[PDB]
Amino acid sequence: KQKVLPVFYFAREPHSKPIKFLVSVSKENSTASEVLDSLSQSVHVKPENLRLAEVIKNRFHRVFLPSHSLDTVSPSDTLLCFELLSSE
C-alpha cells in the first residue's frame, strides 16, 4: 500500500497553478485506482479528473494502467500527469 509518488497533474481548482501532489499509495488488494483517487480528492475534485501513469526507469513512460503489481516501494516510479474537466 506504500509507494511514494509525487505526481504533476493539471488541477481543476479555482485556477491556481497546476497541482503536483505527493500521494503515497499503492494498488491495495483491490485496485490501482486508489492511488488515482488520492490525487483527485487532494484537488477537491471527483476522482475522474486525473489518470496518466508513466514509469521512470528502464521502464520508460506509460499510461494510467489497471490494477497493477507495480505497487512496490519506488519513489520515482510511474508518474501521472492528467487534466480532466471537473470540479467540486
Euclidean distance between CA atoms 85 and 78, whole angstroms: 23
Give the H/E segment covering residue 41.
helix 33-42
The helix/strand/coil state of 40 is helix
Distance CA 5, CA 15 (A): 23
Third-level CATH fold of 1-88: Ubiquitin-like (UB roll) (3.10.20)
Q: Could you tell me if 54 and 77 are in contact, meaning their C-beta atoms sit under 8 angstroms apart?
A: no
Q: Which residue matches cell numbers 490494477?
A: 67
Q: Is 81 exposed, middle or buried (0-12, 13-18, 19+ CB in 10 A)?
A: middle
